[PDB]
Amino acid sequence: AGLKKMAQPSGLVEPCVVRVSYGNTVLNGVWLDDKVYCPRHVLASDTTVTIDYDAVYHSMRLHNFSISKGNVFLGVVGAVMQGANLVITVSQANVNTPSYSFRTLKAGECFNILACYDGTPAGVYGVNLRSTHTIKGSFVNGACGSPGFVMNGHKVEFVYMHQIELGNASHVGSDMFGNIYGGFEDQPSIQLEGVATLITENVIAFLYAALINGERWWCSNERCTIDSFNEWALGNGFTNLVSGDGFSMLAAKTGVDVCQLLSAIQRLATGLGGKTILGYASLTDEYTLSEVVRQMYG
Amino acid sequence: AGLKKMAQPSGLVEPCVVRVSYGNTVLNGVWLDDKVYCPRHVLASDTTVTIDYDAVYHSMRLHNFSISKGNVFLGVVGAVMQGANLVITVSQANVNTPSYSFRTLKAGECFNILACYDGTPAGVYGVNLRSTHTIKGSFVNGACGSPGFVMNGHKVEFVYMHQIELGNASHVGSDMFGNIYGGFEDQPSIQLEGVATLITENVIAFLYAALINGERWWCSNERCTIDSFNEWALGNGFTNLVSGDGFSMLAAKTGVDVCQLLSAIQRLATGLGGKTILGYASLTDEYTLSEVVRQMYGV
Numbered sequence: 291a292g293l294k295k296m297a298q299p300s301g302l303v304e305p306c307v308v309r310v311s312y313g314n315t316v317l318n319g320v321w322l323d324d325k326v327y328c329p330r331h332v333l334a335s336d337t338t339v340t341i342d343y344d345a346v347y348h349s350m351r352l353h354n355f356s357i358s359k360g361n362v363f364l365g366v367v368g369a370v371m372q373g374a375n376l377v378i379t380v381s382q383a384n385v386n387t388p389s390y391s392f393r394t395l396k397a398g399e400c401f402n403i404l405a406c407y408d409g410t411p412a413g414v415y416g417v418n419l420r421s422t423h424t425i426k427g428s429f430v431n432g433a434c435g436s437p438g439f440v441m442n443g444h445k446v447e448f449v450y451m452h453q454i455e456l457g458n459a460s461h462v463g464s465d466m467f468g469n470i471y472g473g474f475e476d477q478p479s480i481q482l483e484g485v486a487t488l489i490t491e492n493v494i495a496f497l498y499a500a501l502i503n504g505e506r507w508w509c510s511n512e513r514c515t516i517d518s519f520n521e522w523a524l525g526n527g528f529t530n531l532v533s534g535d536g537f538s539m540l541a542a543k544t545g546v547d548v549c550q551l552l553s554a555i556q557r558l559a560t561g562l563g564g565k566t567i568l569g570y571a572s573l574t575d576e577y578t579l580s581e582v583v584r585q586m587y588g
Numbered sequence: 589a590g591l592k593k594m595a596q597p598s599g600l601v602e603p604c605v606v607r608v609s610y611g612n613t614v615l616n617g618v619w620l621d622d623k624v625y626c627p628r629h630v631l632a633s634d635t636t637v638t639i640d641y642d643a644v645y646h647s648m649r650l651h652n653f654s655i656s657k658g659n660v661f662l663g664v665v666g667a668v669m670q671g672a673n674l675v676i677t678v679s680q681a682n683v684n685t686p687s688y689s690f691r692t693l694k695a696g697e698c699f700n701i702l703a704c705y706d707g708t709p710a711g712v713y714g715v716n717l718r719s720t721h722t723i724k725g726s727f728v729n730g731a732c733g734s735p736g737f738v739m740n741g742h743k744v745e746f747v748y749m750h751q752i753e754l755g756n757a758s759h760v761g762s763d764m765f766g767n768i769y770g771g772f773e774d775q776p777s778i779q780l781e782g783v784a785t786l787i788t789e790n791v792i793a794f795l796y797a798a799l800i801n802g803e804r805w806w807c808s809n810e811r812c813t814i815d816s817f818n819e820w821a822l823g824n825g826f827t828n829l830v831s832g833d834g835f836s837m838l839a840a841k842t843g844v845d846v847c848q849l850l851s852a853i854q855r856l857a858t859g860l861g862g863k864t865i866l867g868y869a870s871l872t873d874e875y876t877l878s879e880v881v882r883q884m885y886g887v
């Protein structure tokens with residue numbers, strides 16, 4: 291009953307956040323087994339001239355690393371560079387290591403940001419990757435290395451590590467495989483995101499959310515083809531639709547066709563009059579199909 | 589960098605949530621130090637008429653009780669009804685019982701809800717108590733006994749325990765002392781919900797979040813005395829403000845005083861005219877002052 295951007299329980303991610311301190315600059319690290327993942331820009335302090343990472347890696351002094359989880363210091367042994375990640379090998383092994391697996395996020399999916407500062411978690415909240423492979427969370431200085439995760443069946447899927455904040459207030463993270471989302475760079479040059487187009491299959495589950503909760507005022511008998519929308523979608527800041535197979539489960543209980551919401555979206559997109567839907571005066575892509583089913587039918 | 593309702597880390601609370609079952613009704617409970625707390629309506633299975641809890645508490649067979657945390661089954665020992673809650677004593681002690689304590693919340697504060705189903709933690713999100721003393725969150729069938737909590741320095745303070753769901757989709761819970769908030773009944777008979785009046789400080793904090801976040805189209809140079817607003821707040825669905833000395837820090841960083849917002853509240857409470865503030869169609873008391881300071885400046 292209701293609809294809120296809720297985050298999954300952060301309890302398993304929480305023991306792994308460490309404080310990685312290389313010289314002056316100190317940031318957040320994900321500690322799993324004997325390895326500690328952190329953004330490689332910790333090795334940089336320039337923040338003014340283009341950084342030649344290939345050279346600074348070979349010219350690194352491990353005596354300056356001091357990694358910690360509270361009062362314990364983990365002893366640094368080695369460190370290799372996996373993309374934009376600086377995978378650091380420490381002697382102590384995280385006794386608190388959950389069952390983890392790395393995965394990459396496909397645009398539109400939801401995941402959980404464990405905002406951390408100085409190796410201490412601050413808050414957990416759910417976000418979705420946008421059409422530009424950037425997120426719109428809440429971050430302040432020192433968050434570099436805060437993990438993002440999805441969790442299915444007592445197993446953590448580290449899908450995000452924070453790297454940098456764009457001027458857009460948009461946040462760019464790396465993959466745990468070392469791959470910047472959206473093709474951006476950890477470089478001190480100005481970078482601009484593209485136009486954020488709303489993810490269509492999240493807006494649909496958001497409209498079934500309104501019909502399950504009885505708000506049927508916006509809905510009418512009109513229906514549009516998957517095709518005519520895909521044509522209309524690009525020119526109106528929306529993503530195209532591949533198929534409508536998964537909604538058929540919800541479409542039956544509601545009795546509202548998939549082709550019928552499309553006619554509504556073409557109308558409702560930049561169309562909400564005074565009347566709002568579920569607390570929103572504009573369509574939103576925050577809510578996925580998975581999230582709707584967990585908040586509506588257990 | 590953004591305004592994002594977020595919950596504090598729920599790691600310490602997750603060891604304590606247990607599956608409490610008494611025959612048909614199965615719902616969640618908090619396992620603190622060898623005592624499981626749960627709503628007293630787990631004993632009742634009837635949702636027709638008003639139920640004599642004093643007579644149902646005595647018609648209680650402890651042998652019927654089934655508590656479990658995963659595969660482990662707890663052995664129930666004692667059971668005393670405290671208010672609208674059930675303090676159940678068991679043999680094993682939650683060995684991971686955090687630095688815990690109870691509290692009752694004055695209206696307007698923000699706390700952290702841990703929704704559970706079948707003794708399984710499932711989500712965690714921030715919510716603030718409305719003036720009617722009903723939070724408004726997400727709860728499906730079987731979430732009775734999901735604890736709320738607020739954490740000040742690794743010490744867990746349990747403040748909520750889910751009891752019932754009203755008509756307005758408003759959610760009602762009980763403190764760990766066994767008192768239904770706002771004075772409600774855990775009975776099936778129909779029950780009214782009050783008119784939600786907005787907490788003024790949390791609206792002011794929400795407005796500073798907008799001035800810090802750039803949206804300054806609604807702000808002009810109007811200063812309003814606090815009493816004229818209080819006289820106006822008693823007649824327009826707001827609350828009277830006690831002090832604005834905590835806002836002294838946000839006012840200096842924005843350069844906008846607290847008086848300007850107070851007049852601005854009188855302006856926009858009528859309606860935002862289709863122009864949203866921070867992605868919000870109307871004024872919102874969701875963001876408390878302290879939570880706004882951790883997100884904007886990071887304390």
Ligand SMILES: *[C@](C)(O)C(=O)N(c1ccc(-c2ccccc2)nc1)[C@@](C)(C(=O)N[C@@H](C)c1ccc(F)cc1)c1cccnc1
Nearest residue numbers: 317331334337429430431432433434453454455476477478
């Ligand atoms: C990290 C260090 O904790 C941090 O908060 N930010 C940051 C700072 C510097 C770098 C960086 C330095 C040298 C080379 C490459 C990257 N990355 C991240 C903040 C302060 C940040 O990103 N600021 C922006 C303006 C920035 C971009 C690029 C850059 F090189 C330097 C700064 C930051 C603040 C808030 C949230 N996230 C990150």
Ligand SMILES: *[C@](C)(O)C(=O)N(c1ccc(-c2ccccc2)nc1)[C@@](C)(C(=O)N[C@@H](C)c1ccc(F)cc1)c1cccnc1
Nearest residue numbers: 615629632634635727728729730731732752753774775776
């Ligand atoms: C709990 C059992 O998990 C549950 O979801 N609900 C509930 C059901 C019954 C009682 C109750 C039983 C006996 C005596 C008094 C109360 N409390 C809670 C739900 C289904 C619920 O609250 N339904 C409403 C209609 C209800 C209110 C009051 C009442 F006495 C009986 C029923 C529920 C649904 C969704 C969210 N929370 C609770």
